[PDB]
Amino acid sequence: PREDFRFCGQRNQTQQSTLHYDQSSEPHIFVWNTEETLTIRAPFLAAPDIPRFFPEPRGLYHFCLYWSRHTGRLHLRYGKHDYLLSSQASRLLCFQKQEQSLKQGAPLIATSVSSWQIPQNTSLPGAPSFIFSFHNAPHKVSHNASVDMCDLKKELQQLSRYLQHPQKAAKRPTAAFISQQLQSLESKLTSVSFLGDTLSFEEDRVNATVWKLPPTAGLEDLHIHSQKEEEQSEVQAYSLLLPRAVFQQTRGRRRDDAKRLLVVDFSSQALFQDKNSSQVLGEKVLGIVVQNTKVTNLSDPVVLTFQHQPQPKNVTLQCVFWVEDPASSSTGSWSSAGCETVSRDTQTSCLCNHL
């Protein structure tokens, strides 16, 4: 709910004691309590000002170790005070597994834990040390309730793996396979549970981003910009303008439920090869999806503007969108229907009345 990771308990102070934090090489959260020092280790960079000593008075101290991925904060609240362990904890990790920790020391008391993947308040046996790691296997069942970020992250790393070396794969994937995967990917992006307003999956040759739309989003247009560093791959940057009508709930729609924006940015056309295998500028294929919605006959069009290096001696640039035939099981094709092109030498803009 409110944080990615919460580990709480009580500490019996039998003497003047210290707080110690280290950045671990391993992606674990390690908590080790000795009589003189409470030690916390996490994969995040150490904040440079971490206080050395705990409050002088002896007694029982309630504590909670907090991690939040989008706030980038790993802080330890302790008794009446709060200690900031890391200020740059913005890294995709999923804590759902406790490892056996056989360290000796002063056991912690009334310990409990809850994470994003395991949101229940789970009491743990008291122990001098605790180790929190992740499962590698996908333990989330086929509930369709929510998709796990780290599971989706590995799936998108798998696709990126194929885009880098599509010649190396064991098979040339059929159209039905690719269509099934792109449906699955879209489905998982609309249902993935995360804490921030935006979640981006940035991989080699693919970048998928999820926007949690506000109720206010229907009121105003949406502007999106990207950065690609101007290498000589023929495409350098893009911008998007999404009209307010695209985000508007339908006339007979109810409940004002949250909707999501999906921008899947491909730097590869491996999944979009028509018959005759037509080429696309910079292999750029840009997927735009409003969750479970099709809009058509737009007054103000969605516009896609692309900066590129010109190669116009024997070629013209035409804005198109990928269309497939359900019940064909055959490769798709490009269509320019309802999409107007303005193609200056170094810049081209696509004006489409639908997405």
Partner: protein, 95 residues
Amino acid sequence: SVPTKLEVVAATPTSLLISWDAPAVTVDHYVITYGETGGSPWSWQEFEVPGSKSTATISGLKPGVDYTITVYASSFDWTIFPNYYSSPISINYRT
């Protein structure tokens, strides 16, 4: 489930020998997970087996306690395992 079959070949009160049919595709490695069926996901355990192997040994279990054992296949080829992991096959073994 890419592993077509999953069976227990042998067992002791605390240990287990599982076996599974390999699929007709390249498997890089398998992931075996096991835990007490009613226990919390924090306590679950897992290890890896090379994809050339079709058996595994699970030991250190409590006697007379139901355990859920799950086997995923895995590889790095998107055209074989698009979600990197297969669909799981699971047994519930009492021991």
